[PDB]
Amino acid sequence: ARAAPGEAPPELLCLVSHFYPSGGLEVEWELRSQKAEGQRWLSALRHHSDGSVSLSGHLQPPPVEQHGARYACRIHHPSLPASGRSAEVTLEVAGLSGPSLEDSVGLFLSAFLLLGLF
Amino acid sequence: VGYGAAGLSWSLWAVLSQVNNKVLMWRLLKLSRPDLPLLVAAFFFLVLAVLGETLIPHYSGRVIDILGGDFDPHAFASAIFFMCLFSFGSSLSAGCRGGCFTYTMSRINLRIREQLFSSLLRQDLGFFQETKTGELNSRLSSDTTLMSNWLPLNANVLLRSLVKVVGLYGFMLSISPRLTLLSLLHMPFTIAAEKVYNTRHQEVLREIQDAVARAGQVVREAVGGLQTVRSFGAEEHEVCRYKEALEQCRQLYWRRDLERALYLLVRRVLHLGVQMLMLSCGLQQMQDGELTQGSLLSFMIYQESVGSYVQTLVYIYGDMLSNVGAAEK
Amino acid sequence: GASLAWLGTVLLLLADWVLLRTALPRIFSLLVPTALPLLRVWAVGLSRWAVLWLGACGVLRATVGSKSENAGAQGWLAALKPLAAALGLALPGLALFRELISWGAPGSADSTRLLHWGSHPTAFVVSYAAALPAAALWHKLGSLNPVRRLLGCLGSETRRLSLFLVLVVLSSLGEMAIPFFTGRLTDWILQDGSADTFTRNLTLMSILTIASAVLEFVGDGIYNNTMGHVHSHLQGEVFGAVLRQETEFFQQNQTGNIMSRVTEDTSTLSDSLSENLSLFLWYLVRGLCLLGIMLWGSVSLTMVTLITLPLLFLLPKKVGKWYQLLEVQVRESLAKSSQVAIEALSAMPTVRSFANEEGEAQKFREKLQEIKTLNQKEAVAYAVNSWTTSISCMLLKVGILYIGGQLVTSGAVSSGNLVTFVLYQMQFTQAVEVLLSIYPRVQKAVGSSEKIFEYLDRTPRCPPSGLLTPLHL
Amino acid sequence: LTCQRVRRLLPCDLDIHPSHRLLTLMNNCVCDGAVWNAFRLIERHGFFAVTLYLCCGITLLVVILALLCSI
């Protein structure tokens, strides 16, 4: 995901796939650590033929200093080790930036060419 | 394959089998003898230029490598300084060499003109009864130019190629004598094509000079007797005659240029074919394990370079011989 | 007049900076969906161009009403329209070109984030600073020597030199199509087991090389035929012009002199013309290809390189007149030698009846001595000009290398693009050196052709022929 | 091979007219700059070999000068 400065980051979605037992799942959102801000909720359980279930943890981060912050979902389940299993993402907030030298010279070339055509 | 080889060798030898050109070139060398110090200086400067140009590439590559990778300002500055130093020296030597060659050409031209005029002044009067003044002047002002019209460029190219070919052949022998012997496939075809083209070229050059002499005689008669042509209202007639002579000259020029272009096309095709053959043979050897990839690339570079140098040597030598022998009168 | 025009221009600038900067992006973002940022940028650019063009038209109409003041203000206002067009269409054109170049590696930051760059004051200033010089150059070009006389000979042959140029361009394209379809050599030759890649690439390369060779053959044939026609036509014209003069023109100009001018000056002129024109056109086309590649590499450094070429062409412009005078003297001395030879060889009974072969030889030797003293200067100038050209191009390369190092340290240019640009800029500078070496040859050709063009342009000092042909006289 | 990094569009020798040039299989690697690099050749073939080859090349020209001087 690539956010913008002052714009609401997209609602991140963590998928926990094909685990049994259904109970005992702990999905925690972290900002890498500190707790990831943003309204976090959970989806219903989706059963499969083999009997395992899947869940979706949904996070809505608040409007977004930082340049390479990570939003991650950590899953703690009895079958997993004590550390659990995590899925992280990268955030970019460089939605605005001044024109580069290459862009300026390219604009000059475009102006020259379009004036030549006319 | 044996039948084909025997037939192709027989055809090449038939095409391959000059003394007049050699003696005229020796005469030109005798006439150029007084310019020996200038030629010595030119050769010295040529050698210095080649030696400097062998050193420039290392520092050019150092600069490129520094820019591409980690940028160390001190190394960048040192490489720039040495590249500039060697380029400066080589350019100075090249300029001196070119100036010396040009002055030698001019001196040879003036010497030719003086000797031809002093020889003409000694002839018997029947010689001047049997010849025309305009044509003599055309010889003295154009064939002398032809005799010395190539030294600055042809001499430089010949000497550079001569300096480089021996070393390149040594290197490619060091890598692979087998492929080095294979690479000699081009020489027969090169020499045969050069022989055919040189014969045609010399013939057409002589015809061109004759036509130029005829047109010069037309102008000579028209301008010398101006008051007589103008008293019969015959200027348009003289202009028509001159235009006919110029048309003949133009057709001869066109034949010369067309044949030269066709020869260049033929030798480009030969070069491409022989390079393809060499690449195929080297690839087969590399697959068989005889030589590695780096050796194959190095040998291809060296062998193509020597092929180009040998073709240039042959062509330039033939061109000098044609230019000298076209001024036979 | 002038005050009203300046006030209108200032008001237009302020309006563009205030309203068109911010209002238009909002309007075209609300009207256009977010799925087409390029469309938003194009719409904003077109709207800005239309507004500025309407303002310029209104200002021009207002100024035309009054004619009491000078016309310089109107001349300056004439560039308002191209400047507005540049301002409006600089960004959308670049965005369209970048989108069309690659569909998987967007440069972005212009087409997307449309309002973030239109309203960006930095981008506004950059667009104005880019549009000002382009508009200035376009207006200067639109508002619009012996070399012209020299080149006027190639008037009726344009339709054939154009074919020559087309064939040269086709050969260049075929030459460049080899790396773009077969890649680098090691990509296929070194791979062991190559059966569908070695043969394919080898055959494609051979076909392209053969096609380029045949195209060069045809172009060279066309060019040589055209140059032969030019040579013949010029010689005929010079001879006719000489014969159209008056009876005393041939008592001031002697037979050998006129003959040398007609037969020898024209031939040297034509040889120089052919050689240098072929060289110039070929290297011009290849330099344009190299410039395209360099622009692909780094646009900024390519512009920096193009800025400094006049600095390299300064000195030749100064020394061209010296070259012309030197060659004029050389031709005159050759003509005097021709006169001596013609006069001596036409009266041999008289020369021998007085035993004066030695005197004729001495006169010829004196003329040759003059020519020799001129040739010494020719050679020295050749050496010094070679030095100057080499040093100039070396300094060009060194300066570009230093600036590229500064840019790579500053992070403005990536290392790979910098290396590619440098490697192609070296070839570009070599071509520039070839052109610099051509320039003195053109000056010498002017010097050589001075007298024959004087003959051609001379006005005979005799009455023209009449029209009376009565049946009975 | 760093020579194959760039595509040669001009003739390797600029004093040769373009119409007289050869269309080479290996562009920018057979040019005199890429081939006759003193440091690379000394590394690959040894100092003695390169020096000997250059001496032989120069002695060819010395022989030509001697022949011209015999006249």
Coordinates of N, CA and C in Angstrom, one line a residue, chain D residues 19-62:
Chain D
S19 N 31.4 6.0 -46.3 CA 31.2 5.1 -47.4 C 32.2 4.1 -47.6
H20 N 33.4 4.3 -47.1 CA 34.5 3.3 -47.2 C 34.7 2.5 -46.0
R21 N 33.8 2.6 -45.0 CA 33.9 1.8 -43.8 C 33.4 0.4 -44.0
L22 N 33.6 -0.4 -43.0 CA 33.2 -1.8 -43.0 C 32.1 -2.0 -41.9
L23 N 31.1 -2.8 -42.3 CA 30.0 -3.2 -41.3 C 30.5 -4.4 -40.5
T24 N 30.9 -4.1 -39.3 CA 31.6 -5.2 -38.5 C 30.5 -6.0 -37.7
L25 N 30.9 -7.2 -37.5 CA 30.0 -8.1 -36.7 C 30.0 -7.6 -35.2
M26 N 31.1 -7.2 -34.7 CA 31.3 -6.8 -33.3 C 31.5 -5.3 -33.2
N27 N 30.4 -4.5 -33.0 CA 30.5 -3.0 -32.9 C 31.1 -2.6 -31.5
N28 N 32.0 -1.7 -31.5 CA 32.6 -1.0 -30.4 C 33.5 -1.9 -29.6
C29 N 33.7 -3.2 -30.1 CA 34.7 -4.0 -29.5 C 36.0 -4.2 -30.4
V30 N 35.8 -4.0 -31.7 CA 36.9 -4.0 -32.6 C 37.5 -2.7 -32.9
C31 N 36.9 -1.6 -32.3 CA 37.5 -0.3 -32.5 C 38.9 -0.2 -31.8
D32 N 39.8 0.6 -32.3 CA 41.1 0.6 -31.8 C 41.2 0.9 -30.3
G33 N 40.3 1.7 -29.8 CA 40.3 2.0 -28.4 C 40.1 0.8 -27.5
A34 N 39.1 0.0 -27.9 CA 38.8 -1.2 -27.1 C 39.8 -2.3 -27.2
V35 N 40.5 -2.4 -28.3 CA 41.4 -3.5 -28.6 C 42.8 -3.2 -28.1
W36 N 43.3 -2.0 -28.5 CA 44.7 -1.6 -28.2 C 44.7 -0.8 -26.9
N37 N 44.4 -1.5 -25.8 CA 44.5 -1.0 -24.4 C 45.8 -1.6 -23.8
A38 N 46.8 -0.7 -23.5 CA 48.1 -1.1 -23.1 C 48.0 -1.9 -21.8
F39 N 47.3 -1.4 -20.8 CA 47.2 -2.1 -19.5 C 46.6 -3.4 -19.6
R40 N 45.4 -3.5 -20.3 CA 44.7 -4.8 -20.5 C 45.6 -5.8 -21.2
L41 N 46.2 -5.4 -22.3 CA 47.1 -6.3 -23.0 C 48.3 -6.7 -22.2
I42 N 48.9 -5.8 -21.4 CA 50.0 -6.2 -20.6 C 49.5 -7.2 -19.5
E43 N 48.3 -7.0 -19.0 CA 47.8 -8.0 -18.0 C 47.6 -9.3 -18.6
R44 N 47.0 -9.3 -19.8 CA 46.6 -10.6 -20.4 C 47.7 -11.4 -21.1
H45 N 48.6 -10.7 -21.8 CA 49.7 -11.3 -22.6 C 51.1 -11.1 -22.1
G46 N 51.3 -10.3 -21.0 CA 52.6 -10.0 -20.5 C 53.2 -8.8 -21.1
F47 N 54.1 -8.1 -20.3 CA 54.8 -6.9 -20.7 C 55.7 -7.2 -21.9
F48 N 56.5 -8.3 -21.8 CA 57.5 -8.6 -22.8 C 56.8 -8.8 -24.2
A49 N 55.7 -9.5 -24.3 CA 55.1 -9.8 -25.6 C 54.6 -8.5 -26.2
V50 N 53.9 -7.7 -25.5 CA 53.4 -6.4 -26.0 C 54.6 -5.5 -26.5
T51 N 55.6 -5.4 -25.6 CA 56.7 -4.6 -26.0 C 57.4 -5.1 -27.3
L52 N 57.6 -6.4 -27.4 CA 58.2 -7.0 -28.6 C 57.3 -6.7 -29.8
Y53 N 56.0 -6.9 -29.7 CA 55.2 -6.6 -30.9 C 55.2 -5.2 -31.3
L54 N 55.1 -4.3 -30.4 CA 55.2 -2.8 -30.7 C 56.6 -2.5 -31.3
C55 N 57.6 -3.1 -30.8 CA 59.0 -2.9 -31.4 C 59.0 -3.4 -32.8
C56 N 58.4 -4.6 -33.1 CA 58.4 -5.1 -34.5 C 57.6 -4.2 -35.4
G57 N 56.5 -3.7 -34.9 CA 55.7 -2.8 -35.7 C 56.5 -1.5 -36.1
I58 N 57.2 -1.0 -35.1 CA 57.9 0.3 -35.3 C 59.1 0.0 -36.2
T59 N 59.7 -1.2 -36.1 CA 60.9 -1.5 -36.9 C 60.4 -1.7 -38.4
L60 N 59.2 -2.1 -38.6 CA 58.7 -2.1 -40.0 C 58.8 -0.7 -40.6
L61 N 58.3 0.3 -39.9 CA 58.4 1.7 -40.4 C 59.9 2.2 -40.5
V62 N 60.7 1.8 -39.5 CA 62.1 2.1 -39.6 C 62.8 1.5 -40.9

